[PDB]
């Protein structure tokens, strides 16, 4: 059970790292998109 | 510019599908984690 806990905690950390980068990638694209739609 | 617009929107949609799944995966693991911590 202790190893299950550890692996669960590692998976959760791995998901947090993915979410951090993807949310930054989305925010950067939303900003660029807003600029482009204003231009168009 | 029109091509940039289309690709930005496709990328944002792909990022939103990833975020939806990754957040559900994280929430499910947090739920399991609390249960495991209660067992332990």
């Amino acid at each position: 059970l202790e190893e299950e806990l550890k692996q669960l905690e590692e998976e959760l950390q791995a998901i947090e790292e993915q979410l951090a980068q993807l949310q930054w990638k989305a925010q950067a694209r939303k900003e660029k998109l807003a600029q482009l739609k204003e231009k168009l | 510019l029109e091509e940039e617009l289309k690709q930005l929107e496709e990328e944002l949609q792909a990022i939103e599908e990833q975020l939806a799944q990754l957040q559900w995966k994280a929430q499910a693991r947090k739920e399991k984690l609390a249960q495991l911590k209660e067992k332990l």
Partner: nanobody
Amino acid sequence: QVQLQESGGGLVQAGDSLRLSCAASGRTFSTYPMGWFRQAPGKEREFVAASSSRAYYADSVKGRFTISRNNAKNTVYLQMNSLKPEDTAVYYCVADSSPYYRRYDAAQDYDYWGQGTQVTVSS
């Protein structure tokens, strides 16, 4: 087509500072993570720094090097202080154009690579 062009390398003495520049000239790069890798003699390309939601640094350069970006100019920079002979390497600018997850410290997860600039730190 799309490229990343590094400049600012050269020969330097131990203890000096140096600033590397990388101009991205393909398309917009403000939505892409950008970073630096290096290859020293007889070693593999190794992670130096990356910039996205935040700055990341290899342990070997933390507190001596700073990564920064000028989004308007489509450029990324590597500010280097307290240079040592083991910092001698070819320094490569990199970019990640993927909308999918990519690991900031894995060379294979960057799809755009500059040609590299040589930095030499004499003892």
